[PDB]
Amino acid sequence: QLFRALVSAQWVAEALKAPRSSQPLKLLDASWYLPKLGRDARREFEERHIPGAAFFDIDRSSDHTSPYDHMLPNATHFADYAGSLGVSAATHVVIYDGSDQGLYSAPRVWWMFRAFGHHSVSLLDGGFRHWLNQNLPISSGKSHSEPAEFSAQLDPSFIKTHEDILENLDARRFQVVDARAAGRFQGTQPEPRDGIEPGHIPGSVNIPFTEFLTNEGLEKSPEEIKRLFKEKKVDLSKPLVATCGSGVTASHVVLGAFLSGKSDVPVYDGSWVEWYMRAQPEHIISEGRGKTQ
Ligand SMILES: Cc1cc(=O)[nH]c(SCC(=O)c2cccc3ccccc23)n1
Ligand code: NA
Ligand code: NA
């Protein structure tokens, strides 16, 4: 009783050859990379992308009035932007990116469409990496589309707030799962944002987003995902909230839970950037020694 979250490269290639008029397919490249990788997602799209794809820029689908990173825009802003990419309520949106990991930032966009009330959305398992590995056809050129009518409404159950995370330190009403790399979580490797130092939220559990994916960047099976959660002491029959640096890679936790039957995993959108900025010293658990310490 959920719309499929994953489609395969083979499924996509077939759809490109057999298009479905009543349910049009819109392919979106949502690649986004941290600056230190020295990659230009938009330019890469211009060079190669899945045929007929548009480029979904997650910096044009964020609230720039926030001091935090990658915050959900309001619904009017999202709808304007999704309609400008040619997405209507009839559309089966399929999102990918070109990350080394397979999928990286695309899960965030799958989550956002759902959050804003568009449930016919999936992700291309293995992303562009796998598409290229299969020697499937590619196109070049800047992104474009005719505009379409799109409406959005945010369901707030998709989000948790700082206030919620804070209340939960004592209340322990939900399990917080943090998708950052282990060393950022532990406090021994740097955070990408200048002025943010690493560490973790007290009581949270680290499941780096890479552990949801196979060695070659395909999704693990639901059998293996359930095993992962359980080995990390996360109980899927209890509430679960996903978090990371800025709320982007958190969406792999959300996806993994969705594929294992649990559809209601909210994202703490403010994530570690917000948490660190709004913290008292008791709120920052780290093996690293602060400037103050
Ligand atoms: C997506 C992501 C993944 C991740 O592992 N961590 C973060 S923290 C936000 C951030 O570094 C950041 C976000 C936006 C722009 C920036 C510009 C400079 C440096 C850091 C960031 N974000
Ligand atoms: Na965010
Ligand atoms: Na930093």
Instruction: Find the 177 Cα to ligand 2 centroid distance in Å.
Output: 15
The reply to whether 1-154 and 155-293 are identical in fold is yes
Please state whether 133 falls in left (phi above 0), alpha (psi between -120 and 50) or beta.
alpha
d(CA 84, CA 262): 32
Please state whether 127 falls in left (phi above 0), alpha (psi between -120 and 50) or beta.
left
Return the bridge partners of 206, or none: 178
Does 193 belong to an annotated binding site?
A: no
**Nearest ligand 1 atom to alpha carbon 249:** 3
Q: Do residues 192 and 184 touch, judged by C-beta distance below 8 A?
A: no
Q: Do strands 205-206 and 92-96 pair parallel, antiparallel, or not at all (unpaired)?
A: unpaired
Nearest to 166 by CA among 268, 62, 263: 268
Ordered by start, the domain boundaries in the chain are 1-154, 155-293
Resolution value (Å, 1 decimal): 1.7
Q: What is the DSSP string of 128-160?
A: HHHHHHTT---B-S--------------GGGEE
Catalytic residues: 244
**Nearest ligand 1 atom to alpha carbon 181:** 5
| Ligand 1 neighbourhood includes 248 CB (under 6 angstroms) | yes
Name residue 180's amino acid: R
Please state whether 144 falls in left (phi above 0), alpha (psi between -120 and 50) or beta.
beta
Specify the fold of 155-293.
Oxidized Rhodanese; domain 1 (3.40.250)
Instruction: Find the 170 Cα to ligand 3 centroid distance in Å.
Output: 28
Q: Which residues, at least 6 apart from 221, have a Cβ–Cβ distance to it below 8 Å?
A: none
d(CA 217, CA 139): 23
Q: Which residues, at least 6 apart from 290, have a Cβ–Cβ distance to it below 8 Å?
A: 197, 281, 284
| Ligand 1 neighbourhood includes 35 CB (under 6 angstroms) | yes
Approach to solving? X-ray
Place of tokens 């291309």: 124
Instruction: Find the 21 Cα to ligand 2 centroid distance in Å.
Output: 35
Q: First vs last Cα of the chain: how many Å apart?
A: 51
Tell the CATH superfamily of the 1-154 domain: Rhodanese-like domain (3.40.250.10)
| Ligand 1 neighbourhood includes 178 CB (under 6 angstroms) | no
| Ligand 1 neighbourhood includes 277 CB (under 6 angstroms) | no
Instruction: Find the 193 Cα to ligand 3 centroid distance in Å.
Output: 5
| Ligand 1 neighbourhood includes 34 CB (under 6 angstroms) | yes
| Ligand 1 neighbourhood includes 207 CB (under 6 angstroms) | no
Q: What is the DSSP string of 5-69?
A: SEE-HHHHHHHHHS--TTS-EEEEE-----GGG---HHHHHHH-B-TT-EE--GGGSS-TTSSSS
- Residue located nearest, by CA, to atom 1 of ligand 1: 248
Q: Do residues 122 and 6 touch, judged by C-beta distance below 8 A?
A: yes
Output b/e per residue, 254-277; b: 16+ Cβ within 10 A.
bbbbbbbebeebbbbbbbbbbbbe
**Nearest ligand 1 atom to alpha carbon 271:** 8
- Residue located nearest, by CA, to atom 7 of ligand 1: 245
Please state whether 114 falls in left (phi above 0), alpha (psi between -120 and 50) or beta.
alpha
d(CA 280, CA 119): 38
Q: Do residues 186 and 286 touch, judged by C-beta distance below 8 A?
A: yes
